[PDB]
Amino acid sequence: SGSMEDFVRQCFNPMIVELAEKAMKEYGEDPKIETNKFAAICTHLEVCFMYSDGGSKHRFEIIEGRDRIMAWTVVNSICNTTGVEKPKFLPDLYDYKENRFIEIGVTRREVHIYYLEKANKIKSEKTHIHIFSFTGEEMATKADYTLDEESRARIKTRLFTIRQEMASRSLWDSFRQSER
Numbered sequence: 001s002g003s004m005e006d007f008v009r010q011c012f013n014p015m016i017v018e019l020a021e022k023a024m025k026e027y028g029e030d031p032k033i034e035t036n037k038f039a040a041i042c043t044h045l046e047v048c049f050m051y052s053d054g055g056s057k058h059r060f061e062i063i064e065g066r067d068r069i070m071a072w073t074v075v076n077s078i079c080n081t082t083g084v085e086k087p088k089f090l091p092d093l094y095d096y097k098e099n100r101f102i103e104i105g106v107t108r109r110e111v112h113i114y115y116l117e118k119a120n121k122i123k124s125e126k127t128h129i130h131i132f133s134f135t136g137e138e139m140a141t142k143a144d145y146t147l148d149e150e151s152r153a154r155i156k157t158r159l160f161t162i163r164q165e166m167a168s169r170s171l172w173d174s175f176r177q178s179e180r
């Protein structure tokens with residue numbers, strides 16, 4: 001789906017597109033062939049960055065996007081300084097205000113299905129899950145949404161805009177049905 005490749009390179013900042021290309025090739029996947037997955041990885045990374053800008057200065061440490069050594073440097077450091085237990089898998093963010101790791105989900109499916117999958121693969125009581133969709137729906141652990149409605153609205157409106165531009169290019173149907 002090379003027209004989706006064109007969309008991704010036009011839609012996302014070059015720093016995001018470059019990181020997503022690297023991430024896919026690390027798993028032997030070709031961004032030029034799995035173009036729907038490339039778009040999905042760019043979207044999740046953009047959401048993670050928008051979320052980290054969503055509250056007070058330095059509220060959040062970003063873990064997603066970092067090379068593995070630096071990501072685990074951030075996590076092991078945080079788990080020595082704040083004493084919070086050590087996750088088995090790298091989470092997306094750490095929230096200094098609530099003293100918890102956050103896992104961010106972005107889904108073309110239903111939020112409840114994706115929430116349960118994240119909860120099950122995580123198996124760690126401490127990690128806060130926040131799920132976004134392209135349709136305006138969000139859902140978070142204990143209905144605790146972490147950010148104010150205005151910052152969440154920026155994220156939800158950004159995902160809608162992406163869905164709308166995909167739809168105008170007849171890319172949305174394939175993209176929505178690509179997720180597994």
Ligand SMILES: O=c1cc(-c2ccc(O)c(O)c2)oc2c([C@@H]3O[C@H](CO)[C@@H](O)[C@H](O)[C@H]3O)c(O)cc(O)c12
Nearest residue numbers: 023024027029037040041044092104105106179180
């Ligand atoms: O770097 C990666 C990061 C993640 C990823 C996904 C969700 C998160 O919440 C998350 O923190 C990280 O997913 C990747 C996937 C797949 O990306 C699909 C769409 O994001 C997912 O639906 C699939 O399950 C994934 O395997 C690849 O194929 C390749 C990759 O390099 C990556």
Ligand SMILES: [Mn+2]
Nearest residue numbers: 064090091092
């Ligand atoms: Mn992640």
Ligand SMILES: [Mn+2]
Nearest residue numbers: 092103104105
């Ligand atoms: Mn995530």
